[PDB]
Amino acid sequence: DIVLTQSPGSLAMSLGQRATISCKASQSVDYDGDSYMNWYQQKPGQPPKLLIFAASNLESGIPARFSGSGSGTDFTLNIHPVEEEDAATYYCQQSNEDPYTFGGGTKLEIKRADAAPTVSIFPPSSEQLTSGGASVVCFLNNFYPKDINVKWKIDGSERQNGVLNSWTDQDSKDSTYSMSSTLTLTKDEYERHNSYTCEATHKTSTSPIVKSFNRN
Amino acid sequence: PVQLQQSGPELVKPGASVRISCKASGYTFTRYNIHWVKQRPGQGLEWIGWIYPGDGNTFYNEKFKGKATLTADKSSSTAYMQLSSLTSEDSAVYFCTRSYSESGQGHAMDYWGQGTSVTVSSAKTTAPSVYPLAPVCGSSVTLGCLVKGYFPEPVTLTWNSGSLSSGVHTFPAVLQSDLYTLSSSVTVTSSTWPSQSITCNVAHPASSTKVDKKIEPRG
Secondary structure (H helix, E strand, O other): OOEEEEEEEEEEOOOOOOOOOOOEOOOOOOOOOOOOOOEEEEEEOOOOOOOOOEEOOOOOOOOOOOEEEEEOOOEEEEEOOOHHHOOOOEEEEOOOOOOOOEEOEEEEEEEEOOOOOEEEOOOOOHHHHHHHEEEEEEEEEEOOOOOOOEEEEEOEEEEEEEEEEEOOOOOOOOEHHHHHHEEEEEEEHHOOOOOOEEEEEEOOOOOEEEEEEOOO | OOOOOOOOOOOOOOOOOOEOOOOOOEOHHOOOEEEEEEEEOOOOOEEEEEEEOOOOEEEEHHHHHOOOEEEEEEEEEEEEEOOOOOOOOHHHHEEEEOOOOOOOOOOEEEOOOOEEEEOOOOOOOOOOEEEEEOOOOOOEEEEEEEEEEEEEOOOEEHHHHEEEEEOEEEEEEEEEEEEEEEEEEEEEEEOOOOOOOOOOEEEHHHEEEEEEEEEEEOO
């Protein structure tokens, strides 16, 4: 089986710059005068979309910002004017020898200016409390870079058990990230405490961003 | 236009079999290959095999011999993949795609189906609870909608029947108590809400769950 190795595995490029992705094949994927190296873009929740075929041909409907090069065992994909919508994972692919094989994929992050998260905390809804549960939800929205730390404090004491986090993929329009942090307790647990605090540590502030409420 | 429409998401017990369909239109079905690709959650792309509907010829990846069977229906322009002896590790999205035929076209897969998500699990279909998240009892206000305890994927969530689309963050589900939980946030101008109606709409088709939850200020 022809093994395709992509490099880098992860890449961040500023808006309008050039992104370059390399694909190295264990055996040649060019045959006679033809090449069977193809490049695809996959955005979250979507099937892959063909960008380049036969290692240098621009697929119809794909902007000329995408281009490919190389032969034999070494190929490259170039994205000049990198744009916000280009945030995706990129795959090289070989159609030379059965079985067809894919590269491991290269995730492209679009660089942008720093942005502090917009943090909102939500006490459990009354309906959930009637259901016997108590989820305290904290939204940390539209921040950049993606590295962020969330601390949950209950009556001033740090809490780690019962926290579940979810991150959006990079926004295709403004290149920001968003995150939800949920502290789930039982109703009995939740009513044994007064102060609930969601603490965000991000590069845009030397002091943590604090949102809090009292059960009352 | 070339279009490949795949069947919807499937929940299958471990050890059972699943047969997923790929319906083609907009091109001569009997003159192009149909390829099938597997993508485990969070992972890359793995090629399964191809079928040529013109004569029924097939080729299978060695790793998928004995587990995948490719068939094609000429009378309905539909390709099928059956997967057998299903394992929890077989939970993945399976794509059908057609490949270029002409010389110098790299045999690239130029048209793709939307993908069919197969969940292999003995867990039972479960309807979620939907909770409206009002702010604690600025220029903008953020509201939330919590969809807790459903199985299997997926759910769809909209705000004001999809009319309210900007300022929305719907987060990927996480596994909680052997079930799925997701939340969504919507942010609007403070003069907009409490004064204008804002409702989160949730559908979990597997459990026929269809819920509207209007966000109301806390008391």
